[PDB]
Design a protein around this ligand. Structure first.
Ligand SMILES: CC(=O)N[C@H]1[C@H]([C@H](O)[C@H](O)CO)OC(C(=O)O)=C[C@@H]1O
Length: 516
């Protein structure tokens, strides 16, 4: 089914409407005329849909009309500009780097009283190492502007300077990136001297991972303990408490972790080590067959999803009842997950006839992936237009459907059919598992591609033998999305294996991750 640009224009703005506009663009069916009003019809104007629309109608915009005149000067004529224009242009470090040194000296004097930040950057670029100049001034705003301009600067930072960094908004991404990318070794080593009193949440956690890579186990414990105390989500606290346990072996930490209300790999592992029973999994069995809702209409899903997320505690109960049918089971579970404030564990198995003939280990992996990818919503669409319950990128979906399986009249929208999603997921999971084996590694490759996974596993510092392995390696997976995805999918997998009476010990999974 196709939609003309005219029909789409009548739908509400959503990712579904964006997806269908993008299908028109990629088929060259949007004329320069149709493209005129089109911006106000796009829900999320980022990435491919933007670069495609801008092939038809470029934008030069935007320069704020107040400062238009400021952008008529160059490095050769900036001394002719008024003081306001001079200071606007000096917001750009590339602009500052382009100036000649006599003009940087002149402008540094001009701005020393009113804008000593500008002065510091001007004089820093008069040296062969601007980062060293800025660090000597302990100019923290300047430091982050220089880092954003170029990641290549690296220098030792003293105790006073590093303890000032965590107060700046840029600190969190700075610390994450240099620790997981294993860049900027002098910055990295310097961050051993950050007082745990000065950091919290994710930043404290990454500084703990940092301390472990230098085998500073007491500092690491202090960082992870501050993370456990400050993190807002129970899942993240549990990850931090697990590290506290692994490092200092306090049995109260493991007891606290085994009694967590969050189901995650860390609380599951702690339950297993202490002979605690498996957590209770909800049982959803609606007797009603169906209602009026079309589970194959992507526009209906965008609409009802927005109602569910904005619904007060009251309106959730009305929706819960409406969607308490077998045909709408994924929507029911989605509503209940909100309605019970994310306290109960739901692990549904919808459209199960399509998988009941696979072995149970394969069933569990399919279901683990689908739960994480879509929550079993058949018409799910990601911001990069991954499609259906198993969130297939269109390129891969077309390769499998057209080239490999030669399906008659295949269209990428077949990914919205549960039978197609499960079938293709099985097919792709076979390719990955045959090469990768561990369900964790499969999960990383499913989310991030087999290329990145192969490169990570080729490194001699990832998933090898060690004191704190394989846990440390799971913290150092270089893409945040994939690092998180793997932990979540692995927990789902354990749960579904258990529900299918095909249990495995998560300790066996961890042992199989270490190659020799
Ligand atoms: C089965 C499949 O398509 N896997 C792909 C995955 C997926 O679409 C994502 O996990 C959606 O949530 O995305 C990507 C990607 O780098 O974009 C590559 C994977 O090969």
């Amino acid at each position: 089914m196709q939609y003309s640009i005219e029909k789409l224009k009548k739908e509400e703005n959503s990712l579904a409407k964006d997806y269908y506009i993008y299908r028109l663009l990629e088929k060259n069916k949007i004329s320069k005329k149709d493209a005129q009003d089109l911006n106000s019809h796009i829900f999320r104007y980022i990435g491919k849909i933007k670069s495609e629309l801008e092939k038809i109608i470029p934008l030069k915009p935007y320069i704020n009309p107040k400062y238009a005149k400021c952008y008529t000067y160059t490095a050769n004529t900036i001394l002719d500009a008024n003081l306001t224009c001079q200071s606007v242009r000096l917001n750009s470090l590339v602009f500052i780097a382009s100036l000649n040194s006599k003009d940087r000296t002149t402008l540094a004097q001009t701005f020393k009283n009113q804008r000593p930040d500008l002065t510091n950057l001007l004089l820093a670029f008069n040296t062969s190492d601007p980062m060293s100049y800025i660090v000597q001034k302990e100019d923290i705003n300047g430091f982050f502007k220089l880092y954003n301009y170029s990641k290549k600067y690296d220098l030792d930072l003293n105790t006073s300077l590093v303890n000032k960094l965590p107060n700046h908004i840029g600190f969190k991404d700075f610390a994450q990136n240099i620790i997981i990318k294993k860049e900027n070794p002098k910055f990295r080593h310097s961050m051993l001297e950050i007082n745990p009193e000065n950091v919290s949440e994710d930043s404290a956690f990454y500084l703990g991972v940092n301390a472990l890579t230098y085998d500073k186990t007491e500092l690491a414990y202090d960082f992870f303990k501050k993370a456990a105390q400050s993190f807002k989500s129970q899942s993240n606290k549990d990850n931090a408490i697990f590290w506290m346990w692994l490092i200092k072996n306090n049995e109260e930490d493991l007891k606290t972790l085994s009694q967590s209300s969050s189901l995650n790999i860390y609380s599951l592992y702690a339950k297993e080590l202490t002979n605690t029973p498996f957590p209770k999994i909800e049982s959803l069995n609606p007797s009603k067959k169906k209602n009026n809702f079309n589970m194959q209409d992507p526009f209906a899903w965008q609409k009802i999803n927005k109602q569910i997320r904005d619904a007060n505690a009251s309106q959730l109960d009305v929706l819960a009842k409406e969607f308490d049918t077998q045909e709408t089971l994924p929507i029911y579970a989605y509503i209940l997950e909100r309605k019970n404030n994310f306290k109960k564990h739901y692990f549904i198995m919808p459209y199960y006839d399509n998988i009941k003939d696979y072995n149970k280990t394969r069933q569990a992996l399919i279901l683990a992936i689908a739960r994480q990818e879509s929550r079993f919503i058949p018409t799910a669409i990601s911001v990069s237009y991954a499609l259906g319950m198993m969130q297939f990128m269109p390129f891969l979906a077309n390769h499998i459907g057209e080239k490999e399986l030669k399906i008659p009249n295949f269209d990428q929208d077949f990914m919205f059919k549960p039978e197609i999603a499960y079938y293709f997921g099985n097919y792709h999971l076979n390719y990955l598992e045959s090469r990768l084996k561990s369900p964790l590694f499969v999960a990383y490759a499913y989310n991030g591609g087999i290329g990145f996974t192969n490169r990570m596993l080729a490194r001699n510092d990832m998933f090898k033998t060690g004191k704190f392995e394989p846990f440390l390696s799971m913290e150092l997976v270089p893409y945040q999305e994939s690092r998180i995805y793997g932990k979540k999918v692995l927990a789902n997998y354990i749960v579904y294996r258990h529900l299918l009476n095909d249990s495995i010990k998560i300790s066996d999974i961890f042992e199989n991750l270490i190659q020799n």
